[PDB]
């Protein structure tokens with residue numbers, strides 16, 4: 001029989017153009033059949049009625065019932081491409097940073113400010129004009145303030161008085177804008193945050209996209225805080241610039257992929273001061289608008305499936321050479 005690869009995610013992701021481009025390519029494998037789980041089934045049917053698969057590609061995004069996906073995996077015991085339990089941790093920036101540190105991955109110096117919502121003023125925070133002290137640790141402006149929830153994209157950057165003060169407020173892109181300047185110089189007074197040193201880059205973020213530990217595509221984009229005006233092409237896509245990862249960065253990608261147990265994994269690098277710092281690990285993310293990435297991503301995933309499952313299906317399989325980017 002065919003090896004079944006099940007795709008289990010919210011429709012917003014499962015029906016995205018990149019997903020469709022990759023799935024049609026995975027379907028080219030002679031012995032693989034792709035089955036995309038309907039969102040209505042994911043949300044409203046018990047896991048016992050979800051379709052069978054032999055390999056499960058499943059990932060959390062807003063509204064996804066991760067507890068059900070875990071229960072399904074436990075019930076059916078499929079080969080899992082992106083580990084589900086790690087996806088609980090990926091939702092919490094504190095957990096993400098803790099894993100990065102445990103793996104010896106360079107990241108910004110940071111401190112966690114946990115605030116009791118019932119008692120917001122008695123947290124370990126002291127604030128001056130050009131700095132904060134978080135659990136006694138000092139951050140001179142510029143510094144970055146991130147909500148502990150990784151799914152909250154309201155990241156603020158606080159500028160020193162010498163540069164005019166105020167702050168840049170980042171958010172999920174709204175049409176042409178990715179951030180806005182605020183005259184507010186004082187930090188947020190409710191919520192829990194990570195405070196971290198600002199890493200000076202050349203004005204770009206490096207976005208990395210792994211497909212297993214030995215492949216990563218990288219590309220760059222204008223730092224969303226620089227002025228908040230998104231660079232768009234004639235198709236309405238964000239302008240992306242060429243990047244080739246150096247040897248250190250290829251190792252970082254290997255480590256992130258394995259540490260988070262996410263075969264398909266996006267994360268962000270800040271190239272600063274002659275090193276590269278991870279500032280965000282998002283888990284499952286596909287590149288938009290690279291034909292070559294669709295080809296490579298589909299072939300690697302299909303080959304991962306065959307390698308793991310061909311023997312139990314009695315299908316002959318010889319491990320082919322794969323590119324690294």
Ligand SMILES: O=P(O)(O)O[C@@H]1[C@@H](OP(=O)(O)O)[C@H](OP(=O)(O)OP(=O)(O)O)[C@@H](OP(=O)(O)O)[C@H](OP(=O)(O)OP(=O)(O)O)[C@@H]1OP(=O)(O)O
Pocket residue numbers: 061062153172173237238266268280282284285286
């Ligand atoms: O909101 P989510 O998290 O469910 O989905 C978002 C996520 O896509 P994913 O699921 O990972 O593929 C972002 O990638 P990411 O994971 O690297 O995120 P972070 O580094 O944590 O910010 C992506 O930003 P980008 O990397 O393309 O700039 C963003 O596109 P959008 O702002 O629309 O960009 P445009 O199409 O307008 O240019 C998506 O927003 P929506 O689709 O509106 O919800």
Ligand SMILES: Nc1ncnc2c1ncn2[C@@H]1O[C@H](COP(=O)(O)OP(=O)(O)O)[C@@H](O)[C@H]1O
Pocket residue numbers: 108144146150152153154155170196197198199200205223224225268270279280
């Ligand atoms: N320590 C830092 N130094 C400089 N820029 C940062 C730092 N942390 C985040 N940023 C900038 O803010 C953006 C959003 O932060 P990120 O941690 O990626 O949050 P999100 O999960 O919302 O994407 C980054 O892409 C980067 O441009």
Ligand SMILES: [Mg+2]
Pocket residue numbers: 026027028029030031032033034
């Ligand atoms: Mg097929």
Ligand SMILES: [Mg+2]
Pocket residue numbers: 060061282283284
């Ligand atoms: Mg996500």
Ligand SMILES: [Mg+2]
Pocket residue numbers: 173
């Ligand atoms: Mg959007």
Ligand SMILES: [Mg+2]
Pocket residue numbers: 268280
């Ligand atoms: Mg990011």
Ligand SMILES: [Mg+2]
Pocket residue numbers: 150280281282
């Ligand atoms: Mg993120």
